[PDB]
Design a protein around this ligand. Structure first.
Ligand SMILES: CC(=O)NCC(=O)NCC#CBr
Length: 129
């Protein structure tokens, strides 16, 4: 895409050690699946195109971009070693939304709804087996 957007986060790297754990399986089959199909998922399903949105300061402010499309691909590609790396990606995504936007903005209300659902799902994350 545009040279004015940054390259998206890595989803593949043969040098990075990888594992499938029951927790990671849960994060794909339950957590991502639940959030991905939510009414409010669409702003989070791909990286922010700051050019298309006319937000030239977006990647001045957000230095750690993350989106659910990247998380989906990481999970599908078995990119992670553990669940905490994936949880951290979700946390980063929500925090970037809250940093860039204002309390009560539509996208923040959407993020808050998804984050509540995320927290409920993580409360049920199984012990690593
Ligand atoms: C995904 C994310 O961080 N959201 C940012 C975003 O698109 N804001 C639009 C405006 C205004 Br105040």
């Amino acid at each position: 895409g545009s040279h004015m957007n940054p390259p998206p986060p890595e989803t593949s790297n043969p040098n990075k050690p990888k594992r499938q754990t029951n927790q990671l399986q849960y994060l794909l089959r339950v957590v991502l699946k639940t959030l991905w199909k939510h009414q409010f998922a669409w702003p989070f399903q791909q990286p922010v195109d700051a050019v298309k949105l006319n937000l030239p300061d977006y990647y001045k402010i957000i230095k750690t971009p993350m989106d659910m499309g990247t998380i989906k691909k990481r999970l599908e590609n078995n990119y992670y070693w553990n669940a905490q790396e994936c949880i951290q990606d979700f946390n980063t995504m929500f925090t970037n939304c809250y940093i860039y936007n204002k309390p009560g903005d539509d996208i923040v209300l959407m993020a808050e709804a998804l984050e509540k659902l995320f927290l409920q799902k993580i409360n049920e994350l199984p012990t690593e087996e």
